[PDB]
Structure formats: C-alpha cells, structure tokens
Subunit: 140 residues, 4 copies
C-alpha cells in the first residue's frame, strides 16, 4: 500500500486517496540506513509547462525520508515528522520516471537526517533533497 | 486561466485540471510583481496516510506560487523561470480546512528571484515557510 | 561583551577571544521577537578576493539568532543551539558594514525559527539566513 | 599559496594571513575537480562564548572549500565562482581537536556547481553538513 512500512493496524487515509497514491509514489527498498522509491511520470506529476512539478521531487523525498524513519521508530513509541525539506533542482524531467534514493547520514534521538537523490531514467541526478526529520514521543 | 495561474501564453502543454496543481486544487488569488497569494482546500488528496497535510503539499504550493509569480513578470520579456531551490521548514501540522500561502518577493536579480513564502492554516497560524529561489534564464526556444 | 545577552555569571570563552570578538560582531537591540547586530568590514571579515566572506554572513546570523534565543530560554532551564543555518547570497560587500536583523517567526517548545536579513551601508539586502534553533533542557 | 588555496592568479586582493580563513586557520589538503578536503585546528578563535566550535565556523569552512574548489577549475576558463546558497545543518558539537571537511562535487552545470560538504571531528563522527551551491559567471572584468 505504496509498499509503505506496515507499522500500524489502522491508517487514517488509505494509500489510494493520499497525495502519494494519487500521484503514484511506491517504495521499493527500505532499511534503517537506506530506502528507495520511484514514480512513473504522468500529467498528475506535472506542472502546466509539461515538466515534472518541483513539488513532486519535494513530496517524494519527503515521504521516503519520513516513512524510512517511521519504519524504525514507530515501534519504539516515537513518531517522525519532517522538520525541514531543502530541495535543489539541477535538471528537469519531462517524461519516464523519477527514482529517489535516501541515504541516512544522522540518526539522533530527536532528529534523523537523510540525503535524497532524485534521478531520471538515464540515471542523471535531477534533484537532491536534504531531509531533516523530527523524532518525538508518540501522542498516545 | 485554470487555477488562475497567470495567462502569459495562448496555449500550455498541460491543462490545469490534469496537472498536480489542478489535481490537488491549488488556486491563485492575488498576483503582483512583489507579492502573490494562493490557497487550497484540504482534502485527502492533500494528505499523507497519517491524516495530516503532506509535507510535500506545502513544498508544491510554494513552488508553484513563487515560480508562476516570477513567470507573470518575466515571460513577456522572453525569459523563463524555473525553481532552483525550495527550502521548506515545517512548524505546525494542518489536519483540515485550508492552507493559505503568501509569497513576498525579496530579491529580483537578473538570474535569480527570491520569494519568502508563508503557509498558514484557517486560524492564521504559521504552519510552514518556504524559501523559494527561482532561476531566470532566456527561453531556449 | 559584544553586548551578548548576560545570562550566566561565567562564560567558557571571553568575547575578545571568540570568533565573534575576533571578527567584531556586536549586538545592538535584543527583544524576544527581534534582534539586531552589526560588524565593521575589515580584512578579518574578508576572503582573499577582497569581499566579505560568505561564512561571515553565516556566522553573524548564527550568533544573532541563537543568542536571541538564549536571551529568553536560558533562565527557563533551556539551552539553545543552531540546528540549521541556510544562508542565501544576493549581493557582495567589499567594505563598510554588514547589519543583521533577526525576526522571530516561530517559537516552539523544541525549535525557534528566525528570519535574518544582512544589509550593506546603503540598506541593500545582501544576504538572508533562515535560522533554525533547537531548544533543549540544559545539561546540569 | 597561503592556506594552500588554489593558486590561479599571480596576485590576490587580500593576503591569506589577513583573511577570515587565515585568521581562524583553515587549511586545504586535497583538491581535485570533484573532491576537495580542508581542516582547521580548534582554538578559541573558532569557538563561541559557550566553549564550542561556532556554528559559523562550519559554515565558513564549507563555504571556502566548495567555493575555491570551483575556482580551481573555472578561473582559467575566465569564469568566477561565488557562493549562492550555503545550507549547513548541525548534528553534534565539537569542543576541541580539529574540524575536517570533505567537499564532494555532485553537479557541475554551466551556471551552478553543487558540493555536498561533510564536517567531521577527530573521531570521524559527522558533526555538520553543508550543501554548497556555487554560481559560476564570467569574470566581469
């Protein structure tokens, strides 16, 4: 269910109705140190000029990094929420796919940080996101 | 225009309703060379699976608004505008209502325009901000 | 003593030996919501090309925002430390002064955020720093 | 060169020992077009009043290293390099020893080069990172 980490028995929003399921984001690999996700390009991922929307690289990096953090911390009583997403854009994508790889570079008790790379179908680095994720005790 | 994006051309490659912006419901309200506003009604399409507005939705509203606010001025000078950096910081979740964005221009150079975007909930509280850096270049065709 | 907020009876490093005192940073106004600081340009503030070093705008914003946070939270048992400093540069400065104004835009229990503006002697916006400051209970 | 910055000119406006870099003691070790290293011995000149390395010192080491690493390649092509965005994130304080920086080039475009800089303490631990975006432009003289 986008293959998001299954950590709870109920989720307030079903994959298919969330922003992630509407645009088509899917997790491929997840480990505590490294995760990957990808998306086919369709108009839903696009802005009116025909290119993948800036916000789409933002949202992908945000979901991958956060949920890669939930994967470890949820069962320890904690919740994870993005505190900063800094996305920089090097090359546009008109069509094909966007592939993200998140590499964990810091795992602290109140903040985890992930370096995310967003690549096109030729493997070219099209964007990066520095993802900073607040970790806090879950509200009952 | 669809979403009331600025209309600076006679045709666009992708129609509003089919874009990410028109799928999640972003709408521009005011638009001047130094300040622009936009809003969006929260529905599940804007949320992540835990029931709150998706961090990426704030990113994307700020991106569209700061980008197109630049487009509204530079297109007719034969420039294009493409986001070069979006740095969004998150202070408070939104579960429902609206997200309202205001983009304030702080720097208008020949190659980069910079907009500070604030993202507020229905009670006026600052839930997120985004520093939008927009590259301005000549239309390559 | 750079006019930094006087909140403790002892400081591990005297103003004059710190980076701040070496380059000349001085606080003018401080309130919980807003603070200002400035610096004369000298070679110490410069890189080899003759212009104020990028890192100088970074360090100014970092000290102003952090210490404007210490001013309120120290006496409540808390300590403040920068968690992110994002500085963007719009115009160089060769000489004169750099003036910073920090505007608090969020004051949460674990993070305060400040918008800092770095201006030249003509008032022109030369850089900005988004300063994110972690607030944590002080280690005894 | 002073600080072992790249020597790409016969004269510089400000001598190494008088600059911020030479005042706090920054030194470049390796320098290639895709990767550069630099380090600095912690002394009080690097610290803030609470006894730890000043957040701005990390900012400044990353700024110099990513900037000059770009200079080393573009100067002789008649370009200049100036930092456009420095985004430093702080994970662990350093009280003493060294700070060691490695800058890894991740994007080399015609108008922007991007370097990921990591800042490590004497035990190898990642204390800070900086995303360095460098504008590349023609020397305006």
């Amino acid at each position: 269910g986008g293959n998001l980490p299954d950590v709870a028995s109920h989720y307030p929003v079903a994959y298919e109705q969330t922003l992630d399921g509407t645009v088509g984001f899917v997790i491929d690999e997840m480990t505590p140190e490294r995760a990957t996700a990808s998306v086919e390009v369709t108009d839903t991922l696009r802005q009116r000029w025909g290119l993948v929307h800036g916000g789409a690289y933002c949202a992908l990096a945000q979901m991958l990094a956060t949920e890669a953090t939930v994967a470890v911390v949820h069962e320890k009583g904690m919740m994870a929420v993005g505190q900063s997403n800094h996305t920089s854009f090097f090359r546009p994508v008109k069509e094909g796919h966007v592939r993200a790889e998140a590499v964990r570079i810091h795992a602290g008790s109140t903040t985890w940080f992930w370096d995310v790379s967003l690549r096109d179908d030729a493997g070219r680095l099209c964007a990066v996101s520095s993802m900073s994720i607040a970790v806090r005790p879950r509200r009952d």
